[PDB]
Amino acid sequence: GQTDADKYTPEAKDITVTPGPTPDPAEGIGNKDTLPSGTKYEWKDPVDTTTPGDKTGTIVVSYPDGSTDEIQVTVKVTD
């Protein structure tokens, strides 16, 4: 009786951006090719990338069955 979250292991990928609005969360998973098609990506909470610095955020990976993983990443906002 397994869920998708029992089977798949998303990998964090740190990203770098210029100051700007919250980036595309798909950029924070480094092994999307390993995950089922129909897997969705969203930030748990929007990362504030409006100012420079190293931000911490979490990507919610939602599998086709509705189970989830939560993956923390660093977003390096440049000066």
Residue numbers in the entry: 1269 to 1347
Tell me, in the authors' exact words, what the paper reports.
Proteins attached to the surface of group A and group B streptococcal human pathogens that contain tandemly arrayed Rib domains have been associated with invasive infections and proposed as potential vaccine candidates. Here, we study Rib domains from Rib, R28, and from a surface protein from Lactobacillus acidophilus. Together, these 5 structures of homologous Rib domains, and further sequence analyses, show Rib is an example of domain atrophy, a rare event in domain structural evolution involving the loss of core secondary structure elements, and also reveal the remarkable structural malleability of this domain family. The structure, molecular dynamics simulations, and small angle X-ray scattering of a Rib domain pair suggest tandemly arrayed domains are likely to form an elongated rod on the bacterial cell surface, thus suggesting a possible mechanism of immune evasion mediated through domain number variation.
Thus, we solved the structure of “Rib Long” (RibL) (residues 1165 to 1268) and “Rib Standard” (RibS) (residues 1269 to 1329) at resolutions of 1.07 Å and 1.25 Å, respectively. RibS belongs to the “Rib” subfamily, giving a Cα rmsd value of 0.6 Å for superposition with both RibR and RibR28N, versus a Cα rmsd of 2.3 Å for RibL. As predicted, the Ig-fold D/E strands missing from RibR and R28N are also missing from RibS but are present in the RibL structure. Thus, RibL comprises a full Ig-like fold which likely represents the ancestral state of the Rib domain, and RibS is an example of evolutionarily recent domain atrophy from RibL; this is remarkable because there are very few cases where we have the structure of both atrophied and nonatrophied domains that are closely related in sequence. In the atrophy of the Ig-like RibL, a significant loss of the structure (∼20% compared to RibR/RibS) is involved, but the domains remain thermostable with melting temperatures (Tms) of 78 °C and 88 °C for RibL and RibS, respectively, and 71 °C for RibR.
